[PDB]
Amino acid sequence: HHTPQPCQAPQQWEGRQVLYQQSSGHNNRALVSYDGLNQRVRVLDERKALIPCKRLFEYILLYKEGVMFQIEQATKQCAKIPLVESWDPLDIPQNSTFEDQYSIGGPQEQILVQEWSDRRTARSYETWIGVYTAKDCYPVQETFIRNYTVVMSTRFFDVQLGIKDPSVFTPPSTCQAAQPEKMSDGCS
Amino acid sequence: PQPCQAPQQWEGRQVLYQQSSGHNNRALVSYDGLNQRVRVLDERKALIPCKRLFEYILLYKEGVMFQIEQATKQCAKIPLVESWDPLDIPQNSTFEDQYSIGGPQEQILVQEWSDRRTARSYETWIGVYTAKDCYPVQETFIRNYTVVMSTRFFDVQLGIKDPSVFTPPSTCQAAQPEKMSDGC
Ligand SMILES: *[C@@H]1O[C@H](CO)[C@@H](O)[C@H](O)[C@H]1NC(C)=O
Ligand SMILES: *[C@@H]1O[C@H](CO)[C@@H](O)[C@H](O)[C@H]1NC(C)=O
Ligand SMILES: *[C@H]1O[C@H](CO)[C@@H](O)[C@H](O)[C@H]1NC(C)=O
């Protein structure tokens, strides 16, 4: 009945994430470091299971200087990928549409979250949906829609405030050399 | 870390996502695992293209599902081939992970359980439930490493407020045996 205003989402944190992509129907787990103050992000592929072997990479997205580095985890072999997209923080735009509010879990173990979108009233057209906790405004889930169809969804877990170690945003020595082509998911 | 016991009767709300369509479908849901029956009521955040809204009453002990159009109460009777699978963690699940959603003043712990057999390369089901009380959060079905569908649960209230919700309306005598189409 009453419509909240967007809380401010914390702009430096580390935790874990599961990124789902429509086009493959796959989930990818990863450690994540998010520094919205310096507009940089680091993502380290994680495995729960060894079941199909995949190569594992670490990504360092430095938006100020328009590059993302992909880095093979064991070998430290690199790839300099032009990152040309504009910075877009993980937060709730002041003009977001309040969609809904609900609880996850159940009585005695629960948390209220709020769902926010960019859908204009009386339009049915969404490109972005973001779910954040109601008190601390921690990020819970983020979804990108194209033609009424989900393109990717990310869930966030184990969010801790601050950056334990800013050097994670420093690419290894091998990345000046860095090639230009993006390496492949599989050992196969 | 040990499989908890999901409650066998509750009501709340869900979002079902399907890979084939890339769509989300929102519903109110009453889950009655004692009587092996579910009631799903399509709900709407917005008016998009025009989709008809249905209510489904799934009665597994009887082998049938009733599809009921919400305004007109027009009704189909469709047999239920799928046998009953409760929304719980089998006592033989593989523990996958544990993590928190939220932060200091507002945090819950959830556990992720699965189907996977380590060293035999298969997994068809992943379930997320809260650690202490075993409330259901998310359920995902998998085929060859690829998500088929996933449902998220919210606003879970214990119990069934009114068991009549599983009693279909009179019209469901008129056993139109074809499922009603999604379009207007
Ligand atoms: C402002 O908010 C609206 C959501 O109603 C969104 O559509 C629009 O893109 C936002 N403006 C920008 C992107 O600066
Ligand atoms: C967008 O959605 C509509 C309706 O579902 C579909 O007919 C259309 O083909 C889609 N767009 C594209 C580019 O295919
Ligand atoms: C473990 O036990 C069940 C039977 O209760 C068996 O059918 C199941 O497939 C096993 N776990 C899985 C799903 O791999």
Side-chain angles (χ1 to χ4, degrees):
Chain A
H1 296 135
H2 355 75
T3 284
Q5 313 305 292
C7 46
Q8 164 65 264
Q11 289 307 116
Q12 281 195 337
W13 61 265
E14 317 182 283
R16 303 161 59 213
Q17 75 176 28
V18 180
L19 188 165
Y20 162 86
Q21 297 202 21
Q22 142 68 211
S23 68
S24 58
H26 295 153
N27 291 322
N28 295 327
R29 304 184 185 256
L31 309 193
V32 60
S33 307
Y34 172 87
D35 180 358
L37 300 202
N38 306 121
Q39 302 184 1
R40 52 193 194 174
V41 182
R42 178 259 205 170
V43 173
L44 181 73
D45 298 355
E46 217 198 340
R47 287 311 290 286
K48 51 143 173 59
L50 287 11
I51 31 152
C53 182
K54 302 231 154 192
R55 299 184 66 180
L56 297 184
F57 304 96
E58 167 175 33
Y59 301 83
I60 300 173
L61 290 69
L62 308 172
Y63 284 86
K64 284 185 175 323
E65 62 203 49
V67 296
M68 160 176 33
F69 299 95
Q70 166 187 37
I71 292 157
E72 142 62 59
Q73 275 186 32
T75 73
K76 321 302 289 214
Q77 183 184 336
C78 191
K80 244 197 304 189
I81 290 72
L83 168 76
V84 278
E85 299 90 317
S86 26
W87 170 248
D88 189 357
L90 194 66
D91 78 344
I92 307 160
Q94 169 62 207
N95 66 353
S96 282
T97 301
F98 173 70
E99 289 296 345
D100 208 325
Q101 163 165 309
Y102 41 81
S103 64
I104 287 160
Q108 317 329 70
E109 207 183 4
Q110 76 179 27
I111 186 174
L112 195 67
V113 299
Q114 294 180 340
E115 179 175 313
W116 290 91
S117 79
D118 65 350
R119 159 153 59 73
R120 288 174 210 73
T121 61
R123 216 52 48 177
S124 52
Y125 189 61
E126 272 168 335
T127 72
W128 170 78
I129 298 184
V131 180
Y132 287 76
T133 58
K135 292 209 264 172
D136 304 348
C137 210
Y138 281 23
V140 171
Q141 184 164 14
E142 209 190 34
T143 306
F144 298 100
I145 322 298
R146 219 185 207 285
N147 183 44
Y148 298 87
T149 39
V150 166
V151 161
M152 63 182 300
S153 205
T154 315
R155 299 179 269 131
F156 303 107
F157 302 106
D158 292 327
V159 170
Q160 297 283 109
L161 291 198
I163 297 301
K164 186 145 136 81
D165 185 4
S167 41
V168 286
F169 298 110
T170 314
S173 53
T174 86
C175 280
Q176 327 182 41
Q179 69 199 55
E181 226 226 28
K182 165 164 168 201
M183 294 165 271
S184 145
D185 310 46
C187 332
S188 72
Chain B
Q2 182 70 11
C4 54
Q5 310 297 330
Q8 279 291 260
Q9 294 195 320
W10 64 266
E11 305 184 290
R13 308 165 61 197
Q14 58 166 57
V15 189
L16 193 164
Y17 168 78
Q18 295 217 64
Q19 165 74 226
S20 58
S21 55
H23 287 164
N24 286 140
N25 312 105
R26 291 191 198 260
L28 306 182
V29 53
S30 310
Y31 170 87
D32 180 357
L34 292 188
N35 294 304
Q36 310 190 358
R37 53 198 195 171
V38 176
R39 189 268 197 143
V40 178
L41 183 77
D42 292 344
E43 201 211 323
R44 217 69 164 87
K45 8 102 271 294
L47 286 25
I48 348 289
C50 160
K51 305 284 210 129
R52 284 146 94 204
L53 304 177
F54 302 94
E55 173 180 9
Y56 301 87
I57 299 178
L58 284 66
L59 301 183
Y60 281 85
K61 274 180 185 231
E62 300 191 10
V64 282
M65 186 187 74
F66 295 93
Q67 185 189 26
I68 304 167
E69 159 130 49
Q70 289 183 199
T72 66
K73 262 68 108 219
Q74 180 187 345
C75 185
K77 184 171 161 177
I78 326 295
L80 257 184
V81 297
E82 311 88 296
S83 52
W84 169 253
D85 187 27
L87 200 80
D88 69 359
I89 311 147
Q91 90 302 312
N92 69 311
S93 316
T94 300
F95 173 81
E96 289 288 355
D97 213 10
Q98 164 168 311
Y99 33 75
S100 56
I101 293 165
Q105 64 228 38
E106 48 137 65
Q107 188 175 272
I108 49 166
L109 230 151
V110 308
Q111 306 175 338
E112 177 171 306
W113 291 98
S114 96
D115 210 27
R116 162 170 74 83
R117 228 183 288 260
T118 194
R120 204 228 165 76
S121 58
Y122 260 95
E123 196 186 80
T124 73
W125 168 83
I126 297 159
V128 188
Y129 289 76
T130 62
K132 287 135 62 155
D133 306 347
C134 213
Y135 295 115
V137 169
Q138 186 160 358
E139 204 195 30
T140 297
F141 292 101
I142 312 289
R143 225 182 152 68
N144 302 322
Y145 328 117
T146 302
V147 165
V148 184
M149 67 170 77
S150 184
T151 307
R152 291 175 274 130
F153 305 104
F154 312 102
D155 288 337
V156 168
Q157 304 296 152
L158 294 175
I160 308 282
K161 201 208 218 302
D162 170 26
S164 315
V165 294
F166 303 107
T167 299
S170 48
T171 173
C172 289
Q173 176 75 130
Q176 166 191 167
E178 258 170 334
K179 292 202 184 169
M180 292 169 274
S181 95
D182 207 52
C184 331

